[PDB]
């Protein structure tokens, strides 16, 4: 009924896919969705609309796109809400919730510490 | 002895770089390092070599770069290894110490899982 779809950025290097789908399993070993899909915005596949359309297709009503992203900017507030069709293929009884990024969570400054450290 | 830069990417908007400095406020009320800097790696101020002469400036031998990206790319492994000096300024005496960015962090998953329900 509903479905994760986490999206990055997507680079030249494949670390960034490779991070997505590193994610898209973790959240798959969470057990928490029934649907857990993935996309990139640019160079790389599946691409944002190529994800949401593999959501519907296993019978996905409400979309939950987050955007794994540290903060807002012109990708997470053009470029994604457009290639979701939310600014300007979506049946007319699908609807997409386009979630917020990841921002300056503590959990984010524990990360900063560890890497300081080497850990 | 030892400084934190944080190295963001930086935007046209101003969100990117309000980021950083949320972050870098909160390492400062852990109060873990005697210095603590940012910089923008483009379009914004500071700059990436700014941050890294004003952490020398105040008297830092071992400078601890942490790229807060959420994966490598080309960001990470060429741009800012440069404007560090690392790869083609600095003295003798001084270390720039490079970390490792965000990755697939487990509590990227547990951040992740609150955006998708609003929280
Ligand atoms: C659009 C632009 C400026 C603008 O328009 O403001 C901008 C903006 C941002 N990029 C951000 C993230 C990443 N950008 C990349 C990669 C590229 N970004 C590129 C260009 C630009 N990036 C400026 C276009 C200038 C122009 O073309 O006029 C490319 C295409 C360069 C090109 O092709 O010119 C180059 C790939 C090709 C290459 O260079 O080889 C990667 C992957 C990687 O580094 O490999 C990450 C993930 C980093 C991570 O993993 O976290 C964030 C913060 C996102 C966040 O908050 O997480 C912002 C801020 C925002 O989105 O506002």
Same mark, same amino acid.
């Given at each position: 009924?509903?479905?994760?779809?986490?999206?990055?950025?997507?680079?030249?290097? @494949?670390?960034?896919?490779?991070?997505?789908? $590193?994610?898209? +399993?973790?959240?798959?070993? &969470?057990?928490?969705?029934?649907? #857990?899909?993935?996309?990139?915005?640019?160079?790389?596949? @599946?691409?944002?609309?190529?994800?949401?359309? $593999?959501?519907? +297709?296993?019978?996905?009503? &409400?979309?939950?796109?987050?955007? #794994?992203?540290?903060?807002?900017?012109?990708h997470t507030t053009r470029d994604i809400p457009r290639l979701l069709g939310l600014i300007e293929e979506i049946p007319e009884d699908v609807e997409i919730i386009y979630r917020e990024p990841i921002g300056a969570d503590?959990?984010?400054?524990?990360?900063?510490?560890?890497?300081?450290?080497?850990?």
């Amino acid at each position: 009924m509903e479905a994760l779809v986490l999206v990055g950025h997507g680079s030249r290097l @494949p670390y960034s896919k490779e991070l997505l789908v $590193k994610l898209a +399993e973790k959240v798959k070993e &969470r057990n928490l969705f029934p649907i #857990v899909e993935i996309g990139l915005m640019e160079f790389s596949e @599946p691409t944002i609309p190529q994800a949401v359309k $593999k959501a519907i +297709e296993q019978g996905a009503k &409400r979309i939950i796109v987050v955007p #794994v992203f540290l903060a807002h900017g012109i990708h997470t507030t053009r470029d994604i809400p457009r290639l979701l069709g939310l600014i300007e293929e979506i049946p007319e009884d699908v609807e997409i919730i386009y979630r917020e990024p990841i921002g300056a969570d503590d959990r984010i400054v524990d990360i900063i510490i560890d890497r300081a450290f080497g850990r």
